[PDB]
């Protein structure tokens, strides 16, 4: 696993290999 | 599992391989 | 895998191999 | 699975090899 | 599992395999 | 007055929608 | 006045949007 | 008066938005 | 007057946005 | 007058927000 990134002027966040849980209401 | 990006001005987030979970009401 | 993008200026986020899950009411 | 992306102002998100799943009412 | 970066400019955080849980209302 | 937001995919999701008055 | 404001990918979620008066 | 802001992904969350009277 | 702030990744929170009256 | 700010990532939070009157 092996991760890189390449970004510039990006507005946002980058992840990586995400996977948080679920949501309930 | 290799990730790399490129992006100049984008206006949202990136994510890679990506599986958070399910929402329920 | 391997992931690469190249985007000027979205206005949206960008996924990959994105599957989060099911949604009930 | 190689993805890459080439989009100036799109004004949606865009996803790869996305699948995530059922809704029920 | 080795991971590395290469950002810019970004205007958000860089995350790296995270998997923090679950939110419930 | 004006609100001028965007969304870009909003998956799975049960309520989105900005409310101004 | 105004809000002017944006969103990613809200996916999973249950209530988003910019409230205003 | 103005917010001027943005939001790159609010994954599985249940309540944004910003305020402004 | 103005705000102008932003939000890079709000995963899983519950209550976000700025309040300026 | 004016704030200017921003936030990286505010995982899994409950309320966050500046406040300027």
């Not at 970004?7 to 949501?23: W, Y």
């Amino acid at each position: 696993a092996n991760f890189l990134v390449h970004s510039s002027n990006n507005f946002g966040a980058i992840l990586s290999s995400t996977n948080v849980g679920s949501n309930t209401y």
